[PDB]
Amino acid sequence: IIDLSQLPEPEVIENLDFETIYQELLGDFREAMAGEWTAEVESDPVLKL
Amino acid sequence: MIGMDRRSGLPLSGLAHLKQSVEDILTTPLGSRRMRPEYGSKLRRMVDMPVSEGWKSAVQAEVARSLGRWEPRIGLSAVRVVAVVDGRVDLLLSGVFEG
Amino acid sequence: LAEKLRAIAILDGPNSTDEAAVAYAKNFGSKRLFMVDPGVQVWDSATN
Amino acid sequence: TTCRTADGDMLDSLCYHVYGHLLGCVEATLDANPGLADEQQPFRAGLLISFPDMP
């Protein structure tokens, strides 16, 4: 009888940090907007979204 | 009020924000928005209704309704049916500018 | 082909100098030809 | 009160015609439906949603 609730936590889904989630979304966004991306498109309201 | 442009993401406040809200409202139907089934217009349901004098009483109401609900910064002047060409109904919508 | 369809055949000249762009457009003379000479540089998603 | 969807029907559109409002009426539908959320938001042609009473 050994308590299993005293171990390091198991991750069932991977727990990425805030930065590699952001660039993973940007890559998908560029593919969707392919042929339409412009410097003006990456505006301040769009980035804060 | 400061909003973002629909295409290109640019922050515009007065001129095109008042235009991207009105011109969207006339072609956005009801129930297309998520959890907001009362936003939009009945103008997509006014297609293929017979063009009568009671039909213009509905479109001049639904322009005054759907913009009167969700766009208080626009004062509607006149919705005059000016031409019936080939079934196409030309409705002139001259709006005032605010801000 | 543009007269058979009553279309406007949009051409594009070479990306060479303007002496070669005028000397290419001096062959056509027809009203259904629209020539856009300088080649567009566009960002690619494949070659990045 | 189980109803059958169509292949393009969506959840918030359906229970607005049934109930009349959407405050606390969509997630209660996802609560009292086994595996409805697992199914994609554009519903298939013949899924069964049981709409509960007293929203």
CSV table of C-alpha atoms in Angstrom, one decimal:
chain,number,residue,atom,x,y,z
A,1,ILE,CA,0.0,0.0,0.0
A,2,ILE,CA,2.0,3.0,-1.4
A,3,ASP,CA,0.5,6.4,-2.0
A,4,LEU,CA,0.9,7.3,-5.7
A,5,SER,CA,-0.2,10.9,-5.2
A,6,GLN,CA,3.2,12.0,-4.0
A,7,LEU,CA,5.0,11.8,-7.4
A,8,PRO,CA,5.8,14.4,-10.1
A,9,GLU,CA,2.7,15.2,-12.2
A,10,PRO,CA,1.9,13.2,-15.3
A,11,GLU,CA,1.1,15.2,-18.5
A,12,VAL,CA,-1.6,13.5,-20.6
A,13,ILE,CA,-1.4,16.4,-23.1
A,14,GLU,CA,1.9,18.2,-23.6
A,15,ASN,CA,2.1,21.6,-21.8
A,16,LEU,CA,3.8,24.0,-24.2
A,17,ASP,CA,4.8,27.5,-23.1
A,18,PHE,CA,3.3,30.7,-24.4
A,19,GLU,CA,5.9,31.4,-27.1
A,20,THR,CA,5.9,28.2,-29.1
A,21,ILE,CA,2.1,28.1,-29.1
A,22,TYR,CA,2.1,31.6,-30.7
A,23,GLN,CA,4.5,30.8,-33.5
A,24,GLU,CA,2.6,27.5,-34.2
A,25,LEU,CA,-0.6,29.6,-34.7
A,26,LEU,CA,1.2,32.1,-36.9
A,27,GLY,CA,2.5,29.3,-39.2
A,28,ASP,CA,-1.0,28.0,-39.7
A,29,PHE,CA,-2.2,31.6,-40.3
A,30,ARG,CA,0.3,32.2,-43.0
A,31,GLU,CA,-0.8,29.0,-44.9
A,32,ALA,CA,-4.4,30.1,-44.7
A,33,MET,CA,-3.6,33.7,-45.9
A,34,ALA,CA,-1.1,32.4,-48.5
A,35,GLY,CA,-1.1,34.9,-51.4
A,36,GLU,CA,-2.7,37.6,-49.3
A,37,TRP,CA,-0.2,38.3,-46.5
A,38,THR,CA,1.1,41.8,-46.3
A,39,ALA,CA,3.0,43.8,-43.7
A,40,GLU,CA,-0.1,45.9,-43.2
A,41,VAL,CA,-2.1,42.7,-42.5
A,42,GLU,CA,-0.1,42.0,-39.3
A,43,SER,CA,-1.4,45.1,-37.6
A,44,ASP,CA,-1.5,45.8,-33.9
A,45,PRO,CA,-5.2,44.8,-33.3
A,46,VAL,CA,-4.7,41.5,-35.2
A,47,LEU,CA,-1.5,40.7,-33.3
A,48,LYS,CA,-3.2,41.3,-29.9
A,49,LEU,CA,-5.9,38.9,-31.0
B,1,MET,CA,-15.0,55.1,-31.2
B,2,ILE,CA,-12.0,53.3,-32.6
B,3,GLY,CA,-12.3,50.0,-34.3
B,4,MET,CA,-10.3,47.8,-36.7
B,5,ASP,CA,-10.9,47.5,-40.4
B,6,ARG,CA,-12.4,44.2,-41.6
B,7,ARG,CA,-9.8,43.5,-44.3
B,8,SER,CA,-6.2,44.5,-43.7
B,9,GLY,CA,-6.7,45.0,-39.9
B,10,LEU,CA,-6.1,48.7,-39.9
B,11,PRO,CA,-7.4,50.9,-37.0
B,12,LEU,CA,-9.9,53.3,-38.5
B,13,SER,CA,-12.5,55.2,-36.4
B,14,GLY,CA,-14.8,57.5,-38.3
B,15,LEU,CA,-15.3,57.0,-42.0
B,16,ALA,CA,-14.9,53.3,-42.9
B,17,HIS,CA,-15.9,52.0,-39.5
B,18,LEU,CA,-19.4,53.5,-40.0
B,19,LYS,CA,-19.4,52.0,-43.5
B,20,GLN,CA,-18.2,48.5,-42.7
B,21,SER,CA,-20.9,48.3,-40.1
B,22,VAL,CA,-23.9,49.5,-42.2
B,23,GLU,CA,-22.9,47.7,-45.4
B,24,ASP,CA,-22.3,44.5,-43.4
B,25,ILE,CA,-25.7,44.7,-41.7
B,26,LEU,CA,-27.7,44.8,-45.0
B,27,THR,CA,-26.2,41.5,-46.2
B,28,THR,CA,-25.7,39.7,-42.9
B,29,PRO,CA,-28.7,37.5,-42.1
B,30,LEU,CA,-30.3,36.7,-38.8
B,31,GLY,CA,-28.8,33.8,-36.8
B,32,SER,CA,-25.5,33.8,-38.6
B,33,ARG,CA,-23.8,35.2,-35.6
B,34,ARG,CA,-22.9,32.8,-32.8
B,35,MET,CA,-25.2,33.1,-29.7
B,36,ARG,CA,-26.7,36.3,-31.2
B,37,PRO,CA,-29.7,35.2,-33.3
B,38,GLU,CA,-31.2,38.7,-33.4
B,39,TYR,CA,-28.2,40.4,-35.1
B,40,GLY,CA,-28.5,40.8,-38.9
B,41,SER,CA,-31.3,41.8,-41.2
B,42,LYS,CA,-34.4,40.4,-42.9
B,43,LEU,CA,-33.2,41.7,-46.2
B,44,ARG,CA,-31.8,38.3,-47.1
B,45,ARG,CA,-35.4,37.1,-46.6
B,46,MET,CA,-36.8,39.9,-48.7
B,47,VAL,CA,-35.4,38.2,-51.8
B,48,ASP,CA,-38.1,36.9,-54.2
B,49,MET,CA,-40.9,38.6,-52.4
B,50,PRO,CA,-43.2,40.5,-54.8
B,51,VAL,CA,-42.3,44.2,-55.2
B,52,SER,CA,-45.4,45.9,-53.9
B,53,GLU,CA,-46.1,49.1,-52.1
B,54,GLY,CA,-46.4,47.1,-48.9
B,55,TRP,CA,-43.0,45.5,-49.6
B,56,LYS,CA,-41.3,48.9,-49.6
B,57,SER,CA,-43.0,49.6,-46.2
B,58,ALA,CA,-41.2,46.5,-44.9
B,59,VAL,CA,-37.7,47.3,-46.4
B,60,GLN,CA,-37.8,50.9,-45.1
B,61,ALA,CA,-38.8,49.4,-41.8
B,62,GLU,CA,-36.1,46.7,-41.8
B,63,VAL,CA,-33.5,49.2,-42.7
B,64,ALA,CA,-34.7,51.4,-39.9
B,65,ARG,CA,-35.0,48.4,-37.6
B,66,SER,CA,-31.7,46.5,-38.2
B,67,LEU,CA,-29.7,49.7,-38.2
B,68,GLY,CA,-31.8,51.2,-35.4
B,69,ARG,CA,-31.0,48.2,-33.2
B,70,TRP,CA,-27.3,47.7,-33.7
B,71,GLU,CA,-26.0,51.0,-35.2
B,72,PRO,CA,-27.1,54.1,-33.2
B,73,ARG,CA,-24.3,56.3,-34.7
B,74,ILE,CA,-26.0,56.4,-38.1
B,75,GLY,CA,-29.1,58.6,-38.9
B,76,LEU,CA,-31.0,57.1,-41.8
B,77,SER,CA,-32.3,59.7,-44.3
B,78,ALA,CA,-34.3,58.0,-47.1
B,79,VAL,CA,-34.7,54.5,-48.6
B,80,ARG,CA,-36.2,55.3,-52.0
B,81,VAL,CA,-36.8,52.6,-54.6
B,82,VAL,CA,-35.5,54.4,-57.7
B,83,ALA,CA,-35.5,51.7,-60.5
B,84,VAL,CA,-36.9,48.2,-61.3
B,85,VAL,CA,-34.8,47.0,-64.2
B,86,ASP,CA,-35.0,43.3,-64.7
B,87,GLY,CA,-36.4,42.2,-61.4
B,88,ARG,CA,-33.4,44.0,-59.8
B,89,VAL,CA,-34.7,46.6,-57.3
B,90,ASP,CA,-32.5,49.7,-57.0
B,91,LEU,CA,-32.9,51.1,-53.5
B,92,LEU,CA,-31.0,54.3,-52.8
B,93,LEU,CA,-29.6,54.5,-49.2
B,94,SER,CA,-28.1,57.9,-48.5
B,95,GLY,CA,-26.7,58.0,-44.9
B,96,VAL,CA,-25.4,60.9,-42.9
B,97,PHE,CA,-21.9,60.9,-41.5
B,98,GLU,CA,-21.1,61.3,-37.8
B,99,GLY,CA,-17.9,61.9,-35.9
C,1,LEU,CA,-8.5,34.5,-80.0
C,2,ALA,CA,-9.6,37.7,-78.4
C,3,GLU,CA,-11.7,38.7,-81.4
C,4,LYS,CA,-13.4,35.3,-81.4
C,5,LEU,CA,-14.6,35.9,-77.8
C,6,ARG,CA,-14.8,39.7,-77.9
C,7,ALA,CA,-12.4,39.5,-75.0
C,8,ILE,CA,-9.4,41.6,-73.8
C,9,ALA,CA,-6.3,39.5,-74.0
C,10,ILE,CA,-4.0,40.8,-71.2
C,11,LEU,CA,-0.4,40.4,-72.3
C,12,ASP,CA,2.8,40.9,-70.4
C,13,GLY,CA,6.1,41.9,-72.0
C,14,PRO,CA,9.5,40.7,-71.1
C,15,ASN,CA,11.2,41.7,-67.9
C,16,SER,CA,14.1,43.3,-69.9
C,17,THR,CA,14.9,47.0,-70.3
C,18,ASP,CA,12.4,49.5,-71.6
C,19,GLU,CA,14.0,49.5,-75.0
C,20,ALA,CA,13.0,45.8,-75.2
C,21,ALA,CA,9.5,46.5,-73.8
C,22,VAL,CA,8.6,49.1,-76.5
C,23,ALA,CA,10.2,47.0,-79.2
C,24,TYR,CA,8.0,44.1,-78.2
C,25,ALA,CA,4.8,46.2,-78.1
C,26,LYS,CA,5.4,47.5,-81.6
C,27,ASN,CA,4.3,44.2,-83.1
C,28,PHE,CA,0.7,44.1,-82.0
C,29,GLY,CA,-1.4,47.2,-82.8
C,30,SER,CA,-4.8,45.6,-82.0
C,31,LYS,CA,-7.3,47.1,-79.7
C,32,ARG,CA,-8.0,43.9,-77.7
C,33,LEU,CA,-4.5,43.6,-76.2
C,34,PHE,CA,-3.5,45.0,-72.9
C,35,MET,CA,0.2,44.9,-72.0
C,36,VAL,CA,1.6,45.1,-68.4
C,37,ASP,CA,5.4,45.2,-68.8
C,38,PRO,CA,7.2,45.1,-65.4
C,39,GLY,CA,7.2,41.7,-63.8
C,40,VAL,CA,5.7,41.5,-60.3
C,41,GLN,CA,7.9,40.3,-57.5
C,42,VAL,CA,5.7,38.3,-55.1
C,43,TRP,CA,6.5,36.4,-51.9
C,44,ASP,CA,6.3,32.6,-52.2
C,45,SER,CA,5.1,30.1,-49.6
C,46,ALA,CA,6.9,27.2,-51.2
C,47,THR,CA,10.5,28.5,-51.7
C,48,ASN,CA,9.9,31.0,-48.7
D,1,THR,CA,-38.3,15.9,-26.3
D,2,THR,CA,-35.7,14.3,-28.7
D,3,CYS,CA,-35.4,16.0,-32.1
D,4,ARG,CA,-33.3,14.9,-35.2
D,5,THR,CA,-30.9,17.4,-36.8
D,6,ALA,CA,-29.9,17.8,-40.4
D,7,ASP,CA,-26.4,17.7,-41.9
D,8,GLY,CA,-25.8,21.5,-41.7
D,9,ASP,CA,-27.9,22.4,-38.6
D,10,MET,CA,-26.1,24.1,-35.7
D,11,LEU,CA,-26.8,24.0,-32.0
D,12,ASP,CA,-27.5,27.6,-31.1
D,13,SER,CA,-29.8,28.0,-34.1
D,14,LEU,CA,-31.9,25.0,-33.2
D,15,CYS,CA,-32.5,25.7,-29.5
D,16,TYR,CA,-33.4,29.3,-30.3
D,17,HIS,CA,-36.4,28.2,-32.3
D,18,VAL,CA,-37.3,25.7,-29.6
D,19,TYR,CA,-36.8,27.7,-26.4
D,20,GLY,CA,-36.9,31.3,-27.5
D,21,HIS,CA,-33.7,32.5,-25.8
D,22,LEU,CA,-30.1,31.3,-25.5
D,23,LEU,CA,-29.1,32.4,-21.9
D,24,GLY,CA,-28.2,29.2,-20.2
D,25,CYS,CA,-29.8,27.1,-22.9
D,26,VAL,CA,-27.0,25.8,-25.1
D,27,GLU,CA,-24.5,24.5,-22.5
D,28,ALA,CA,-27.4,22.8,-20.7
D,29,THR,CA,-28.1,21.1,-24.0
D,30,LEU,CA,-24.5,20.0,-24.3
D,31,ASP,CA,-24.7,18.9,-20.6
D,32,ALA,CA,-27.7,16.6,-21.0
D,33,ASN,CA,-26.5,14.9,-24.2
D,34,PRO,CA,-23.9,12.1,-24.1
D,35,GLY,CA,-21.1,12.6,-26.6
D,36,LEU,CA,-22.7,15.6,-28.3
D,37,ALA,CA,-19.7,17.9,-27.9
D,38,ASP,CA,-17.4,15.1,-29.2
D,39,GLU,CA,-19.3,15.3,-32.4
D,40,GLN,CA,-18.3,18.1,-34.8
D,41,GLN,CA,-20.1,21.4,-34.5
D,42,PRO,CA,-21.6,21.1,-38.0
D,43,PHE,CA,-23.9,18.2,-37.1
D,44,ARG,CA,-24.3,15.0,-39.2
D,45,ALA,CA,-27.5,14.3,-41.1
D,46,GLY,CA,-29.0,12.0,-38.4
D,47,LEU,CA,-27.8,12.7,-34.9
D,48,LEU,CA,-30.4,12.8,-32.1
D,49,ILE,CA,-30.4,15.7,-29.6
D,50,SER,CA,-32.7,15.4,-26.6
D,51,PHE,CA,-33.7,18.9,-25.6
D,52,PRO,CA,-34.4,19.1,-21.9
D,53,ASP,CA,-37.4,20.8,-20.3
D,54,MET,CA,-37.3,23.9,-18.0
D,55,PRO,CA,-34.2,25.8,-19.4
